[PDB]
Design an enzyme around this catalytic site. Structure first.
Site, PDB file in Angstrom:
ATOM      1  N   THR A   1       3.986  11.301  -8.600  1.00 32.96           N
ATOM      2  CA  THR A   1       4.910  11.279  -9.531  1.00 32.96           C
ATOM      3  C   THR A   1       5.011   9.536  -9.761  1.00 32.96           C
ATOM      4  O   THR A   1       4.898   8.826  -8.973  1.00 32.96           O
ATOM      5  CB  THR A   1       6.260  11.484  -9.109  1.00 32.96           C
TER       6      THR A   1
ATOM      7  N   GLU B   1      -6.106   6.907   5.815  1.00 29.48           N
ATOM      8  CA  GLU B   1      -7.306   5.843   5.350  1.00 29.48           C
ATOM      9  C   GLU B   1      -7.213   4.867   6.432  1.00 29.48           C
ATOM     10  O   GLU B   1      -8.412   4.338   6.854  1.00 29.48           O
ATOM     11  CB  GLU B   1      -6.936   5.376   4.081  1.00 29.48           C
TER      12      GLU B   1
ATOM     13  N   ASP C   1       2.403   1.322  -3.592  1.00 27.47           N
ATOM     14  CA  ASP C   1       1.090   1.724  -4.413  1.00 27.47           C
ATOM     15  C   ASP C   1       0.930   3.401  -4.478  1.00 27.47           C
ATOM     16  O   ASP C   1       0.462   4.143  -5.503  1.00 27.47           O
ATOM     17  CB  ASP C   1      -0.154   1.227  -4.312  1.00 27.47           C
TER      18      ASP C   1
ATOM     19  N   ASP D   1       2.847   5.752  -3.498  1.00 34.17           N
ATOM     20  CA  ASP D   1       4.017   6.264  -4.237  1.00 34.17           C
ATOM     21  C   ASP D   1       4.118   6.445  -5.686  1.00 34.17           C
ATOM     22  O   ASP D   1       4.420   7.299  -6.185  1.00 34.17           O
ATOM     23  CB  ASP D   1       5.365   5.774  -3.827  1.00 34.17           C
TER      24      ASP D   1
ATOM     25  N   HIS E   1      -5.860  -5.540  -1.679  1.00 37.76           N
ATOM     26  CA  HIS E   1      -7.248  -5.500  -1.283  1.00 37.76           C
ATOM     27  C   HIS E   1      -7.846  -6.983  -0.777  1.00 37.76           C
ATOM     28  O   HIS E   1      -8.240  -7.065   0.457  1.00 37.76           O
ATOM     29  CB  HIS E   1      -8.276  -4.880  -2.132  1.00 37.76           C
TER      30      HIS E   1
ATOM     31  N   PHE F   1       7.710   7.816 -10.603  1.00 34.73           N
ATOM     32  CA  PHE F   1       9.033   7.276  -9.775  1.00 34.73           C
ATOM     33  C   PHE F   1       8.952   6.848  -8.483  1.00 34.73           C
ATOM     34  O   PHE F   1       8.199   7.274  -7.815  1.00 34.73           O
ATOM     35  CB  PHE F   1      10.146   8.308 -10.133  1.00 34.73           C
TER      36      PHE F   1
ATOM     37  N   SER G   1       7.849  10.115  -2.855  1.00 35.03           N
ATOM     38  CA  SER G   1       6.629  11.027  -3.045  1.00 35.03           C
ATOM     39  C   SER G   1       5.526  11.010  -2.003  1.00 35.03           C
ATOM     40  O   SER G   1       4.680  12.250  -1.725  1.00 35.03           O
ATOM     41  CB  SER G   1       5.981  11.231  -4.456  1.00 35.03           C
TER      42      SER G   1
ATOM     43  N   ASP H   1      10.034   7.241  -5.455  1.00 35.77           N
ATOM     44  CA  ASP H   1      10.877   8.536  -4.922  1.00 35.77           C
ATOM     45  C   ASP H   1      10.402   8.834  -3.603  1.00 35.77           C
ATOM     46  O   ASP H   1      10.718   9.962  -3.187  1.00 35.77           O
ATOM     47  CB  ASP H   1      10.875   9.488  -6.081  1.00 35.77           C
TER      48      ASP H   1
ATOM     49  N   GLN I   1       0.701  -1.147  -0.062  1.00 39.54           N
ATOM     50  CA  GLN I   1       0.117   0.032  -0.251  1.00 39.54           C
ATOM     51  C   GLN I   1       0.722   1.432  -0.064  1.00 39.54           C
ATOM     52  O   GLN I   1       0.415   2.242  -0.680  1.00 39.54           O
ATOM     53  CB  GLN I   1      -1.068  -0.058   1.132  1.00 39.54           C
TER      54      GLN I   1
HETATM   55  C1  HEM Z   1      -7.050  -1.643   4.972  1.00 42.31           C
HETATM   56  C2  HEM Z   1      -6.310  -1.584   3.666  1.00 42.31           C
HETATM   57  C3  HEM Z   1      -6.734  -0.708   2.511  1.00 42.31           C
HETATM   58  C4  HEM Z   1      -7.800   0.206   2.342  1.00 42.31           C
HETATM   59  C5  HEM Z   1      -8.924   0.597   3.422  1.00 42.31           C
HETATM   60  C6  HEM Z   1      -7.873   0.603   1.063  1.00 42.31           C
HETATM   61  C7  HEM Z   1      -8.742   1.287   0.420  1.00 42.31           C
HETATM   62  C8  HEM Z   1      -8.842   2.028  -0.886  1.00 42.31           C
HETATM   63  C9  HEM Z   1      -9.686   3.044  -1.577  1.00 42.31           C
HETATM   64  C10 HEM Z   1     -10.965   3.467  -0.818  1.00 42.31           C
HETATM   65  C11 HEM Z   1      -9.427   3.095  -2.684  1.00 42.31           C
HETATM   66  C12 HEM Z   1      -9.917   4.092  -3.700  1.00 42.31           C
HETATM   67  C13 HEM Z   1     -11.014   3.260  -4.445  1.00 42.31           C
HETATM   68  C14 HEM Z   1     -11.502   4.117  -5.832  1.00 42.31           C
HETATM   69  O1  HEM Z   1     -12.119   5.259  -5.464  1.00 42.31           O
HETATM   70  O2  HEM Z   1     -11.489   3.541  -6.906  1.00 42.31           O
HETATM   71  C15 HEM Z   1      -8.280   2.431  -3.054  1.00 42.31           C
HETATM   72  C16 HEM Z   1      -7.541   2.326  -4.191  1.00 42.31           C
HETATM   73  C17 HEM Z   1      -6.069   1.540  -4.507  1.00 42.31           C
HETATM   74  N1  HEM Z   1      -5.729   0.682  -3.547  1.00 42.31           N
HETATM   75 FE1  HEM Z   1      -6.064   0.370  -1.620  1.00 42.31          FE
HETATM   76  N2  HEM Z   1      -6.798   0.136   0.220  1.00 42.31           N
HETATM   77  C18 HEM Z   1      -6.000  -0.727   1.293  1.00 42.31           C
HETATM   78  C19 HEM Z   1      -4.959  -1.330   1.108  1.00 42.31           C
HETATM   79  C20 HEM Z   1      -4.298  -1.561  -0.257  1.00 42.31           C
HETATM   80  C21 HEM Z   1      -3.043  -2.559  -0.349  1.00 42.31           C
HETATM   81  C22 HEM Z   1      -2.534  -3.435   0.554  1.00 42.31           C
HETATM   82  C23 HEM Z   1      -2.706  -2.437  -1.775  1.00 42.31           C
HETATM   83  C24 HEM Z   1      -1.415  -2.867  -2.590  1.00 42.31           C
HETATM   84  C25 HEM Z   1      -0.799  -3.691  -1.895  1.00 42.31           C
HETATM   85  C26 HEM Z   1      -3.720  -1.381  -2.153  1.00 42.31           C
HETATM   86  C27 HEM Z   1      -3.459  -0.633  -3.615  1.00 42.31           C
HETATM   87  C28 HEM Z   1      -4.411   0.133  -4.110  1.00 42.31           C
HETATM   88  C29 HEM Z   1      -4.223   0.651  -5.437  1.00 42.31           C
HETATM   89  C30 HEM Z   1      -3.037   0.344  -6.371  1.00 42.31           C
HETATM   90  C31 HEM Z   1      -5.323   1.892  -5.652  1.00 42.31           C
HETATM   91  C32 HEM Z   1      -5.414   2.884  -6.694  1.00 42.31           C
HETATM   92  C33 HEM Z   1      -5.218   4.138  -6.368  1.00 42.31           C
HETATM   93  C34 HEM Z   1      -5.170   4.924  -7.456  1.00 42.31           C
HETATM   94  O3  HEM Z   1      -4.183   5.070  -8.521  1.00 42.31           O
HETATM   95  O4  HEM Z   1      -5.976   6.127  -7.298  1.00 42.31           O
HETATM   96  N3  HEM Z   1      -4.403  -0.858  -1.373  1.00 42.31           N
HETATM   97  N4  HEM Z   1      -7.892   1.668  -1.826  1.00 42.31           N
HETATM   98  O1  LIG Z   2      -6.410   4.037   0.958  1.00 43.09           O
HETATM   99  C1  LIG Z   2      -6.394   4.444  -0.468  1.00 43.09           C
HETATM  100  N1  LIG Z   2      -5.741   3.583  -1.145  1.00 43.09           N
HETATM  101  O2  LIG Z   2      -5.018   2.282  -0.713  1.00 43.09           O
HETATM  102  C2  LIG Z   2      -7.267   5.333  -0.800  1.00 43.09           C
HETATM  103  C3  LIG Z   2      -7.837   6.098   0.403  1.00 43.09           C
HETATM  104  C4  LIG Z   2      -8.919   7.243  -0.178  1.00 43.09           C
HETATM  105  C5  LIG Z   2      -8.968   7.636  -1.333  1.00 43.09           C
HETATM  106  C6  LIG Z   2      -8.108   6.981  -2.504  1.00 43.09           C
HETATM  107  C7  LIG Z   2      -7.230   6.116  -2.012  1.00 43.09           C
HETATM  108  O3  LIG Z   2      -6.608   5.594  -2.977  1.00 43.09           O
HETATM  109 CA   LIG Z   3       6.473   8.615  -6.700  1.00 40.61          CA
END
Ligand code: HEM
Ligand SMILES: O=C(NO)c1ccccc1O
Ligand SMILES: [Ca+2]
Ligand SMILES: *[C@@H]1O[C@H](CO)[C@@H](O[C@@H]2O[C@H](CO)[C@@H](O[C@H]3O[C@H](CO)[C@@H](O)[C@H](O)[C@@H]3O)[C@H](O)[C@H]2NC(C)=O)[C@H](O)[C@H]1NC(C)=O
Ligand SMILES: *[C@@H]1O[C@H](CO)[C@@H](O[C@@H]2O[C@H](CO)[C@@H](O[C@H]3O[C@H](CO)[C@@H](O)[C@H](O)[C@@H]3O)[C@H](O)[C@H]2NC(C)=O)[C@H](O)[C@H]1NC(C)=O
Ligand SMILES: *[C@@H]1O[C@H](CO)[C@@H](O[C@@H]2O[C@H](CO)[C@@H](O)[C@H](O)[C@H]2NC(C)=O)[C@H](O)[C@H]1NC(C)=O
Ligand SMILES: *[C@@H]1O[C@H](CO)[C@@H](O[C@@H]2O[C@H](CO)[C@@H](O)[C@H](O)[C@H]2NC(C)=O)[C@H](O)[C@H]1NC(C)=O
Length: 595
Positions: free
Chosen positions: A184, A258, A108, A110, A351, A186, A190, A188, A105
């Protein structure tokens, strides 16, 4: 003719040229093409977008238009039928610590962020969407199926707003709709320093010439720092317990609060910067506020890179690691470092790795108090539990001693995320991460499952029986086929994650290809990659290889007993050694002889 020009609404400046430090925005990495990998630009498209009307409208939007002859199933029904389960027993990953999930997370966050559309500093739109579920403009509601319990208690839909998009904002046209990456590309750090010059400065401590990051002044963790609180009111972290009134934290990335264990990781990282800057000022008393800042910052970026590529990726990719990320051969200026749109969905495999509870542990790693273990849903946007309930240490010990959830074809995402997710805008603990991810695939205009199978040079099943062979599961394949009618329509997020795992890995073949490709690119296309000759000296590099997540914990918390390999499942006390036995980062190669 490429329409090639649109470099409008995005922040631009001029290239320091020969400067040994990354820009905050990621501009000036690639010399011949300065905006490659910079924050606030379109996600890259490895494949053409697939929209209902060719251009912008997502599949499912018009209730009478099909995808390949068929109605796409409702996101929440795919959720109820495939993703949900009731029995938490037996679900833990026997060979991955809770930090495995948690690091994913961080990485991700970053690399990518596609923020929601606003058009409301006040508006009946951020309420015509939640109140009446009317589809329109950027309101793209998640409708409840017949027989969904949430009908009886919550209403007709879950509100959902479409992602931001490049060039302009308002109603837009011409080209296909391209989502923004506000971060970004990278690796990095961020997420620690910010992606905008605006925020980067706020984060800094400019009251003194020590190159430190701003720290909370209202509260301390046994004389160790916390992240500053956020100005922002209303504050969702405040709304979570109005008696306690503890705001969210202010970090380089907006998602930091979050969940409690993510805020924990953020605060370890801030603490590391400040530690580095102090130590650095000791060796080099003549150095600037700025020089202290950038030099600590560059070390930290190197850290996030090393742990990610040395410790974390080999155990996600497994045996497919070698096939996609070959050993580094130097910076390649022709490699495109931009995060692709599909990557932000492939990386959502994490997730399915989130367990249902979070533990606090005392100094012997025993349950800390009578309420040591808590449902994850009470921890979304919860800062009060850190400040007012033991600080960081009891929460970091949990990360080392507990396990990630294991991806399982019959138990995908815990109800904590699937039924009780709290969204910072709205008020209930009643959202569904799985359905949202699926709705978001459609929002981003994603090609279907067989398009990506094709892309990765893997078989493209067309029949029930073909899908059974790929998934190695008759029942899963049958449910998918009943909801979707053809595998060409299977949303990438659910398709990629339904695949059995590769050997020694934690994703399947399609996911390994998508992730592997992206990572290879972001390493090979990074002028500031740590091994890139001339970015660090040979002696500096030798010092950096000794870094470990274990050490980070030793230097930043009052934990004295840690595992050596922190990502694998570790049992206390056998697998835990004293901090002394853990290699230290030797900062002496950073000395600067004047005369
Ligand atoms: C309890 C832990 C976590 C919570 C509560 C959570 C919650 C969220 C939420 C609410 C979103 C936005 C969904 C949307 O509007 O499309 C999101 C996106 C995302 N999550 Fe999670 N997440 C968690 C853990 C993780 C983990 C462990 C990973 C990867 C190992 C991850 C990777 C991602 C990625 C790559 C996105 C797309 C973000 C973007 O580019 O906008 N998350 N997450
Ligand atoms: O926790 C998150 N992502 O893992 C997340 C939380 C709120 C809004 C956008 C998001 O990508
Ligand atoms: Ca970055
Ligand atoms: C629990 O997960 C462990 C995490 O890696 C795993 O042990 C590791 O097994 C791999 C190969 O299967 C090896 O890893 C590394 O291999 C060589 C060492 O010969 C290095 O040069 C590479 O760079 C790479 O790091 C190791 O042998 C080992 N890794 C560690 C960190 O100890 C366990 O097997 C898992 N437990 C079970 C039973 O599944
Ligand atoms: C809202 O946040 C509150 C924390 O600011 C929290 O209340 C706190 O939690 C418990 C009571 O449940 C108390 O902890 C213990 O305190 C003393 C030890 O000094 C004991 O004598 C008590 O019996 C108790 O076990 C905190 O003192 C208490 N603080 C206050 C001011 O109420 C609430 O639980 C939170 N509510 C929600 C909905 O999460
Ligand atoms: C910016 O850095 C300065 C310098 O460390 C911080 O001020 C110090 O805080 C500690 C604890 O109160 C004390 O030793 C002194 O009051 C300060 N030191 C000096 C040299 O005067 C300050 O807290 C930081 N500011 C922010 C907002 O984080
Ligand atoms: C840097 O990476 C680029 C981008 O993949 C490589 O470009 C390739 O050039 C080789 C010959 O050197 C061709 O075989 C490939 O077909 C090219 N790829 C494409 C699709 O353009 C290049 O190999 C790398 N540069 C060096 C010298 O390492």
């Amino acid at each position: 003719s490429w329409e090639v020009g649109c470099g409008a609404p995005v922040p631009l400046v001029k290239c320091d040229e020969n400067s040994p430090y990354r820009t905050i925005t990621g501009d000036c990495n690639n010399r011949r093409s300065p905006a490659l990998g910079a924050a606030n630009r379109a996600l890259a498209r490895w494949l053409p977008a697939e929209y209902e009307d060719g251009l912008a409208l997502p599949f499912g939007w018009t209730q009478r238009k099909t995808r390949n002859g068929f109605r796409v199933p409702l996101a929440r029904e795919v959720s109820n039928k495939i993703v949900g389960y009731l029995d938490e027993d037996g679900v833990l990953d026997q060979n991955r610590s809770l930090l495995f999930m948690q690091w994913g997370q961080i990485v991700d966050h970053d690399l990518d962020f596609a923020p929601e559309t606003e058009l409301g500093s006040n508006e009946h739109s951020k309420t015509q969407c939640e109140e009446y579920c009317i589809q329109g403009d950027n309101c793209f509601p998640i409708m409840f199926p017949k027989n969904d319990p949430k009908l009886k208690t919550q209403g007709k839909c879950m509100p959902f707003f479409r992602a931001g998009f490049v060039c302009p904002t308002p109603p837009y046209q011409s080209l296909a709709r391209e989502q923004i990456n506000a971060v970004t590309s990278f690796l990095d750090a961020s997420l620690v320093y910010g992606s905008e010059p605006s925020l980067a400065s706020r984060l800094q401590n400019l009251s003194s010439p020590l190159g430190l990051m701003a720290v909370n002044q209202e509260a301390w963790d046994h004389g160790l720092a916390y992240l500053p609180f956020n100005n922002r009111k209303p504050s969702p972290c405040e709304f979570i317990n109005t008696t306690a009134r503890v705001p969210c934290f202010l970090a380089g990335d907006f998602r930091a609060s979050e969940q409690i264990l993510l805020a924990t990781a953020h605060t370890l990282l801030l603490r590391e910067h400040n530690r580095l800057a102090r130590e650095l000022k000791k060796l080099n008393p003549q150095w600037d506020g700025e020089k202290l800042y950038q030099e600590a910052r560059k070390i930290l970026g190197a850290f996030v890179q090393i742990i990610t590529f040395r410790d974390y990726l080999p155990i996600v990719l497994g045996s497919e690691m070698q096939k996609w990320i070959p050993p580094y051969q130097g910076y390649n200026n022709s490699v495109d470092p931009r995060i692709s749109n599909v990557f932000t969905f492939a990386f959502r495999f994490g997730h399915m790795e989130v367990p249902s509870t979070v533990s606090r542990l005392d100094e012997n790693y025993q349950p800390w108090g009578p309420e040591a273990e808590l449902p994850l849903h009470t921890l979304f946007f919860n800062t009060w539990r850190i400040i007012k309930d033991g600080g960081i240490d009891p929460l970091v010990r949990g990360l080392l001693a507990k396990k990630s959830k294991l991806m399982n074809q019959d138990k995908m995402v815990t109800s904590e995320l699937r039924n009780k997710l709290f969204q910072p805008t709205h008020k209930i603990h009643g959202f569904d991460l799985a359905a949202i991810n699926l709705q978001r695939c459609r929002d981003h205009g994603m090609p279907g499952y067989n398009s990506w199978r094709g892309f990765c040079g893997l078989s493209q099943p067309k029949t029930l029986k073909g899908l059974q062979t790929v998934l190695k599961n008759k029942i899963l394949a049958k449910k998918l086929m009943d909801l979707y009618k053809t595998p060409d329509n299977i949303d990438i997020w659910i398709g990629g994650n339904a695949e059995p795992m590769v050997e020694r890995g934690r994703v399947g073949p399609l996911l390994a290809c998508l992730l592997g490709r992206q990572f290879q690119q972001i390493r090979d296309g990074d002028r500031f990659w740590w091994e890139n000759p001339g970015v660090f000296t040979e002696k500096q590099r030798d010092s950096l290889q000794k870094m470990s997540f274990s050490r980070l914990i030793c230097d930043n918390t009052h934990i004295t007993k840690v595992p050596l390999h922190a990502f694998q499942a570790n049992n206390y006390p056998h697998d835990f050694v004293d901090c002394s036995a853990v290699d230290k980062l030797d900062l002496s190669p950073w000395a600067s002889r004047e005369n």
